[PDB]
Amino acid sequence: MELIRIAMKKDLENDNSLMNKWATVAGLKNPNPLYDFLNHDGKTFNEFSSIVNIVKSQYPDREYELMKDYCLNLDVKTKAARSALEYADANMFFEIEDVLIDSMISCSNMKSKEYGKVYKIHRELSNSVITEFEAVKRLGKLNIKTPEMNSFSRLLLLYHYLSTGNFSPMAQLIKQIDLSEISENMYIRNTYQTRVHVLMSNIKLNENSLEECREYSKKALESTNILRFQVFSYLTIGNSLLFSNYELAQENFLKGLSISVQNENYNMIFQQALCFLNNVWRKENKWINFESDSIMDLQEQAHCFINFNENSKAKEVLDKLDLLVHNDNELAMHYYLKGRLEQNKACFYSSIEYFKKSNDKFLIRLPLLELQKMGENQKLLELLLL
Amino acid sequence: MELIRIAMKKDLENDNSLMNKWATVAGLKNPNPLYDFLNHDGKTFNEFSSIVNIVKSQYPDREYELMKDYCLNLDVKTKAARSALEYADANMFFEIEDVLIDSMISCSNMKSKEYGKVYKIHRELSNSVITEFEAVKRLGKLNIKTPEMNSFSRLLLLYHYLSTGNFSPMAQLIKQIDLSEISENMYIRNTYQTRVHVLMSNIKLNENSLEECREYSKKALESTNILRFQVFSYLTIGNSLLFSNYELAQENFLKGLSISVQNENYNMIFQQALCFLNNVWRKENKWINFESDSIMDLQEQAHCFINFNENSKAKEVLDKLDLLVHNDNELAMHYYLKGRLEQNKACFYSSIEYFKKSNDKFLIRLPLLELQKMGENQKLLELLLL
């Protein structure tokens, strides 16, 4: 018997009216399938939402431990296990996901085998085990039959383009996703619906359509109860505000921090966001990571030192950075910083140039702002955001 | 029984040494399969290049009439008919292509059925019978098995993006094509190789990598004997030169006109190219179409009138145009022209704005040049090109 059923029975003896509270929370028409779930091994709810919502409602603090246990006892050939694969991925529960994938790739059920292989491609692409060219090649060769995996094959690519800064294929790819084709699995349909709204929000951020960006993140938030999509919606909203409204940006980053502080990753993500925000607005910065030697944290150190005319301190950090291999995006920042330190238009021009190479219509504001202050034509600077 | 075999036998009796002349031209090791082709109904060459090259060599002036007849008597289930479908499409022989497609969709051979359906999607997308979203949907649903149709499904989309001005997804899509996977049909492999070189040349034009552009068009020309790919290679080379070298641009357009003047479409394409060139360099313009009411020709009329300070005449043409529904690209031109007529910086800014909306890194030079002349910062104007 799974930890979730043990905990639900122990809590059912102390409080007998939890039966109809859980049946409503699970979205069921009567307590019937919930009864089945408690007294017969392997009886799974028609929709995976049912158990998720119960766990979130009743054991919010224990979600990972309980869901891990439940998921890893699931018959890998059922609809519930397929739902579990999505649930693990959505939540970034990698150890659950990888076990599920591994049994699914070589099982007798054809539908489970397909989800298995598609999610494997996603995992491999995320970790740089394979190139994008090999991923798409392998996806073609699967002859994908379910509309679920048909959507996920696009989403998986969308994630990869987003994290490598390769924005241009995104707008066209997302328009091809059609979730209305997914009819058997409502958990997957809705989770994917959330995935799409956050992805849309991000695309809009990159094209500098800031209101639309926020409109899409709000749709994301209203569509989900998964921490991960909430984290990234708050992050995107905050970013969409980074240059225009300090207070509202800060509020969004702190909101995100507050729901996610428990998790080291999410914590760091909001720490970095707050750090950026505070350097952009030239405030005192309690969020600088003095212990990291990554390029991002060092640039923030520099940016801060420069903001406060701590010029010698800036130079040391800039010296440390000139020894590190920069990509196009990181070089754009480098030139921005150099430009600020030496008050040199040429550096801002190079900054613009590299932001343009890396297709960044966001951070490019930094060198554009400096040029404005130096009296360059505001009309031209605005067109450079286009 | 086909007109091509009748004409080849009649020409073989009057001149007996045509046997080894045609065998070399067909690329065969000896006259053997050529003998078979002439004296047994339905014997088709191993590679479709063989009959094409013969026809081009021997009946250049009658290629369409003869190839039409030959193609439409072909067993729709053979490799030669599949080759014929490519040959008709490459050449824009639409009446041959549509008949071939239509019999191929519902024949017993699996491979022919697949090429049939893919090319149908291409035809329908080219004519706006279906949307891009429906094309890709329908292609997924075909479960494409051959590497030939796997390449064509990308090429077909590439064509659509190119003709609708939707450049951003192109770079990523073309990188996914791998023609080295096509082993069974050398005609299709090589024709596609030409398709890819021209498409590459065009992508490079749009990204303003002008040397590479030309390098790709030259590869195109050296790889083909199809008029269509020659036309578009000369057009692209000329366009890559439109702003930098008048003489060499003109030479390329005139070369293209000379090999293609017989065909109404190609004629008009070079007429428009020459027209643009000559307005850009502010010469007398032999190529203005005073009889057309399309937006493109009217803008060229205006551009010319403006070049020669015929300001009232310009204004009438501009008035006529404001009554027609404009695209983003057409509006960009409109503002450019308006800008030149009233020497008004605001119009050039709007021009830049709409070129930016339509992802045009080419014609955008026009309003940029005016701003230079009006003394705006050259560094900033350069960055506006990317």
Residue numbers in the entry:
A (entry chain A), B (entry chain B): 1 to 386
Q: Any passages from the paper?
A:
Bacillus phages use a communication system, termed “arbitrium,” to coordinate lysis-lysogeny decisions. Arbitrium communication is mediated by the production and secretion of a hexapeptide (AimP) during lytic cycle.
The overall structure of each monomer shows an N-terminal HTH DNA-binding domain (residues 1–59) directly connected (only 2 residues) to a C-terminal regulatory domain (residues 62–386) composed of 18 helices arranged in a two-layered right-handed superhelix. The HTH motif includes 4 helices (helix α1–α4), and the predicted DNA recognition helix α3 is solvent exposed, which is compatible with the active DNA-binding state proposed for the apo protein (Erez et al., 2017). These 9 TPR-like motifs (TPR1–9), unlike other members of the RRNPP family, can be further divided in two subdomains, one N-terminal (TPRN-ter; residues 46–281), which would include helix α4 and encompasses six TPR motifs (TPR1–6), and the other C-terminal (TPRC-ter; residues 295–386), including the remaining three TPR motifs (TPR7–9). Protein domain motion analysis with Dyndom showed that this flexibility is due to the different relative disposition of two almost rigid portions, the first one including the HTH domain and the TPRN-ter, and the second one corresponding to the TPRC-ter with a bending region (281–285) placed in the TPR connector that would work as structural hinge. Interactions at the two ends of the TPR superhelix mediate AimR dimerization. Although these two TPRs are involved in all the AimR apo dimer interactions, the specific contact changes among dimers, indicating that this region works through a slipping interface of contact.
